[PDB]
Design a protein around this ligand. Structure first.
Ligand code: K
Ligand code: K
Ligand code: K
Ligand code: MG
Ligand code: MG
Ligand code: MG
Ligand code: MG
Ligand code: MG
Ligand code: MG
Lengths: 121, 170, 94, 173, 306
RNA sequence: CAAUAGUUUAAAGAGCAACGUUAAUAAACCGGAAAACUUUUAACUGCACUGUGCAGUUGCAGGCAAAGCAAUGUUCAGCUAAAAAAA
């Protein structure tokens, strides 16, 4: 549950460190969670691939708010993080330092499921 | 020209307790909450009987669960190994190791929280119903000392010396 | 007090107290004690104590309303209360 | 019965803050023990009746833990001594209901309701209370039912020293 | 309330006799019908009778797929047919059902008189269900039990909601209010404007304002019947049901179901004939996969790549 | 309001709440008057009652117990005490 204009930490190796959400897609409601794609503005980057002031797409990977499962359980992280994506829908990096959860077992996240180090499933 | 009505019979001759499902140390009740109001020796409120009806149903489900599973009596501060099934991933089995930070004893709605830390990703918390069928086994493997709730909360916020196993097994 | 005083007056005149009916009652203005109380920003108000007269007339066999009140006994305290002699063995039977 | 509220404990607010509320109830409880009969408003009487019953329970306990709790409630040493010695032996067999409340109309000035709170077994009692232990007829359904449900039913007052303690003393001496 | 009574006048002697003869003729009725309890075919337009139940509370359970299901428990104490209506006397056909039990000395003589006259217990609640044909009438005294329903169907529930008391616009109607700071003065939770000026010059009817909230009749449609316990007269329904514990709830076959669905369920009609004591506890089976979205793309995704 | 999150120390498996759960895309749903019908010796307070009484005398959210704590058990408190003998 992240409202618009929230700050996120980048967990890929594309060079970006800090981003801010500036828009949503479709009709997700007043907040977005893990598995949704948003539009972000880069605030702090140290690299040649990306620079501060650009606008990119990203996917939410971790959040501090409870994530509920059909069996009645839920889990929580201690940070909010995302991964930058290209216009074709592929990551801009090749190494993700995050814990992948059940949301990414879906077929559309094959590339993330390959470059991620630790997986919960 | 006279029609005699039918008098119901007594289910348990010379037994004063119907034998409803209750915990061992609770004094036995003298009536069944689902019995019609007309056939009761004591006319107790429907509202109070409905509360007692739910308690009987809860105990019936708990008895069946205990016949299916046998878990240890763990406490807060113990390190546990929990075997679970991931319905999302084609019902595959995994084993999780973590610290128990909260335990609620509320009958059939009992639950607990499991805490663990990873090498780089940080802390991770799970809330697990105790009677959920997805859980297959629970075992105690160790203990972590703490002074009070404030000390335990500080430990959780500052991830440290909680990396028992770096990843999940199976 | 007025009701009792009027009945005593009726008996002296030779009327039966068991047939008396309240036939007329009204009030009348008395002499008032005037005063003043201050208000905010220098304004002032009135502070009056009022007084009234009461008149009651009782007559025999006058038209009366049918209202009647039920009467019950008060709480029984002392040797006249015998709730402690109840036998509670009967309620265990069918 | 005494109404239950939504605050911690379900007690009355007595139109006071919690600190002043506890100071008032402790003082009145001390006076009830000393005099055994008090006349006050209905709200203070209802709260005092429920509080008074729980104070007698501590006296019946007769333990070091119970005395410590009571020592913070009672205001006078003489009243505290009476609670554990005299009242403890008085209500050995009575299971609850050590205080009664009877309404007594309205006051004169503010027309507030009033009541009388009194102990339920003593000389000078307003009424005669039922015996602490109810006698059971020898040929009643009640006797048979109690045997089937509670074999340890008490039918007559028990002595201060039970037979087991008496037997032990006799063997010792 | 009612309007003041209208004046009445005696009839002329040349017309009084005629009026009385005609009025009596219209008020003369034939013998009461005698319904027979027998299974009947179900037709495209045929409504069944409902039942009166008591709300017990909420619990939860896990299904065959391991999913947690919230449940509401409804208890049927004693429901019987206590009267009939037919066209000759009332103009339409209906069945009257009663439930509960009360003591004779706690009700008005008018209420107790009806039940005593037919040798029935004094019942706390009474409700009417309209039927389609005279053959749908049930004999007086017939019991309506938990076997009246088929596990896995949909039902409708009606009742009175929980009383909340006198509540304001923010809680009663969800008004936004006014800011907490920036110069606001004693109007944080007030409704604001209630009209305009000289035109229209008044306040419209049913304008939303503070008032009492919480005791009103509401109906929930399309709830699922999860489990049935005929022996103990219990119904387990998924979802929320209006009213607090002990509220009286009316249960009916949902109008959201089509004729084909009712035929497939093979609902009892006019009602279940037999002894419900020797019946087992049944749980509905769902032939669906709650985790299908993890194997196939069925979820909502607004972005089209490339 | 079963579960999850927040909130009260004369505390809690309380109560109220949404950030939580269920349902709806309709001749469905809701409100008051009233014909007709039925019943009656034509009916009419009250459980501390400014939450609710779906509780009126083996009635009860008091007290008391080894008890899940507005539930189970119960001899006490208050409102409202009961019976022909014998055959
Ligand atoms: K106590
Ligand atoms: K309008
Ligand atoms: K509900
Ligand atoms: Mg001045
Ligand atoms: Mg606001
Ligand atoms: Mg100003
Ligand atoms: Mg202000
Ligand atoms: Mg509630
Ligand atoms: Mg209590």
């Amino acid at each position: 549950m992240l409202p618009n204009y929230s700050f996120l930490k980048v967990v890929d190796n594309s060079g970006a460190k800090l981003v801010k959400i500036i828009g949503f897609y479709g009709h997700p409601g007043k907040a977005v969670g893990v598995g949704e794609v948003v539009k972000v503005a880069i605030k702090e980057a140290k690299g040649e691939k990306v620079s501060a002031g650009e606008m990119k797409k990203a996917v939410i990977v971790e959040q501090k708010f409870p994530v509920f499962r059909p069996n009645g359980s839920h889990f929580r992280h201690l940070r909010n993080s995302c991964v930058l994506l290209s216009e074709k829908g592929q990551p801009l990096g090749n190494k993700v330092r995050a814990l992948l959860t059940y949301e990414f077992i879906k077929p559309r996240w094959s590339k993330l499921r390959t470059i991620t180090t630790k997986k919960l499933f | 020209e006279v029609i005699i009505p039918t008098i119901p019979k007594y289910a348990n001759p010379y037994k004063l307790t119907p034998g409803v499902s209750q915990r061992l140390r609770t004094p036995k009740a003298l009536y069944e909450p689902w019995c019609p109001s007309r056939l009761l020796l004591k006319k107790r409120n429907v509202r109070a009987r409905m509360q007692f009806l739910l308690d009987v149903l809860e105990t019936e489900k708990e008895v069946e669960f205990q016949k299916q599973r046998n878990y240890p009596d763990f406490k807060v501060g113990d390190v546990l190994d929990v075997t679970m099934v991931a319905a999302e991933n084609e019902r595959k089995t995994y084993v999780h190791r973590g610290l128990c930070i909260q335990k609620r004893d509320r009958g059939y709605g009992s639950s607990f929280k499991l805490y663990c830390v990873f090498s780089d990703s940080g802390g991770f918390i799970q809330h697990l119903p105790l009677c959920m069928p997805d859980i297959l086994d629970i075992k105690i493997v160790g203990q972590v000392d703490y002074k009070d709730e404030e000390d335990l909360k500080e430990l959780v916020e500052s991830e440290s010396r909680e990396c028992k196993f770096l990843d999940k097994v199976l | 007090e007025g009701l009792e005083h009027a009945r005593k007056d009726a008996e002296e005149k030779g009327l039966d107290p068991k047939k008396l009916v309240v036939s007329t009652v009204y009030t009348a203005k008395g002499k008032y004690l005037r005063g003043f109380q201050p208000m905010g920003k220098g304004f002032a108000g009135r502070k009056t104590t009022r007084k009234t007269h009461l008149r009651i007339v009782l007559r025999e066999n006058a038209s009366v309303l049918p209202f009647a009140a039920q009467v019950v006994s008060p709480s029984r305290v002392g040797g006249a209360s015998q709730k402690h002699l109840r036998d509670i063995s009967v309620r265990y039977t069918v | 019965t005494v109404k239950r509220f939504l605050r911690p404990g379900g007690w009355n607010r007595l139109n006071r803050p919690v600190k002043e509320r506890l100071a008032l109830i402790k003082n009145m409880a001390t006076q009830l023990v000393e005099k055994e009969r008090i006349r006050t408003t209905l709200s203070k009487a209802k709260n005092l009746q429920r509080y008074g019953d729980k104070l007698i329970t501590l006296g019946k306990a007769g333990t070091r833990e119970s005395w410590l709790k009571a020592n913070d409630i009672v205001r006078t040493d003489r009243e505290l001594h009476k609670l554990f010695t005299t009242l403890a032996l008085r209500y050995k067999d009575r299971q609850g209901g050590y205080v009664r409340l009877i309404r007594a109309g309205f006051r004169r000035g503010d027309a507030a309701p009033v009541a009388i709170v009194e102990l339920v077994d003593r000389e000078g009692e307003l009424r005669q209370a039922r015996p602490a232990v109810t006698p059971v007829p020898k040929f009643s359904v009640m006797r048979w039912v109690k045997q089937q449900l509670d074999p340890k039913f008490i039918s007559e007052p028990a002595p201060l020293l039970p037979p087991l303690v008496r037997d032990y003393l006799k063997e010792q001496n | 309330g009612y309007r003041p009574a209208k004046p009445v006048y005696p009839l002329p002697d040349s017309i009084a006799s005629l009026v009385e003869d005609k009025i009596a003729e219209l008020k003369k009725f034939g013998p009461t019908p005698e319904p027979a309890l027998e299974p009947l075919p179900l037709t495209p337009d045929s409504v069944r009778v409902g039942c009166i139940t008591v709300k017990a509370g909420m619990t939860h359970e896990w299904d065959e797929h391991g999913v947690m299901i919230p449940l509401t428990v409804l208890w049927i104490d004693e429901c019987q047919v206590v009267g009939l209506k037919y066209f000759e006397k009332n103009g339409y056909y209906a069945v009257q059902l009663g439930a509960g039990c009360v003591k004779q000395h706690t009700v008005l003589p008018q209420i107790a008189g009806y039940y005593l006259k037919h040798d029935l217990p004094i019942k706390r609640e009474m409700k009417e269900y309209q039927v389609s044909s005279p053959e749908a009438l049930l004999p007086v005294g017939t019991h309506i039990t938990a076997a009246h329903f088929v596990v896995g169907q949909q039902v409708d529930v009606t009742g009175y909601t929980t009383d909340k008391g006198f509540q304001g616009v923010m809680k009663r109607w969800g008004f936004k209010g006014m800011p907490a700071s920036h110069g606001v003065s004693l109007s944080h939770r007030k409704p604001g404007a209630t009209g305009g000026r000289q035109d229209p010059g008044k306040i419209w009817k049913e304008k939303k304002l503070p008032g009492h909230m919480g005791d009103e009749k509401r109906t929930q449609l399309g709830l699922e019947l999860y489990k049935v316990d005929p022996k103990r007269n219990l119904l387990y329904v998924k979802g929320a049901v209006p009213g607090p514990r002990g509220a009286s709830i009316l249960v009916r076959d949902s109008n959201r179901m089509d004729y084909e669905e009712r035929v497939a369920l093979n609902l009892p009609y006019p009602t279940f004939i037999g002894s419900p004591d020797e019946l087992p506890v049944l749980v509905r089976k769902s032939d669906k996969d709650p985790y299908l979205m993890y194997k196939k793309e069925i979820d909502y995704f607004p972005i089209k790549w490339k």
